[PDB]
Amino acid sequence: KPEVEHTHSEREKRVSNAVEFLLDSRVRRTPTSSKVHFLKSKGLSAEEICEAFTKVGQPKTLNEIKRILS
């Protein structure tokens, strides 16, 4: 196949893992930093984490995510 993009199914599934994890009641009670650090360690990118957060009803900018990861 002509590789025009990256495997979006892989990205989509990573975001899926994040959205499910972020929407966890107990995780809703943990700090944002803990959420972000864990998702990153799950193989997600900052952009993907930013999206997953917005998916769970937490609109974070990419700047926040990179900041929290640094």
| Technique behind the model | NMR
Q: What letter represents residue 63's amino acid? A: N
Both tokens of residue 63? 């700047």
Angle between helices 8-22 and 32-41 (to 10 degrees): 150
Instruction: End-to-end CA distance of the chain: give it in Å, rounded.
Output: 36
For the chain, give every domain's residue range: 1-70
Tokens representing 39?
């998702």
Distance CA 16, CA 33 (A): 19
Query: In Å, how far are 7, 13, 24, 38, 41 from 27, measured between CA atoms?
Result: 28, 19, 5, 11, 16
CATH assignment of 1-70?
1.10.10.10
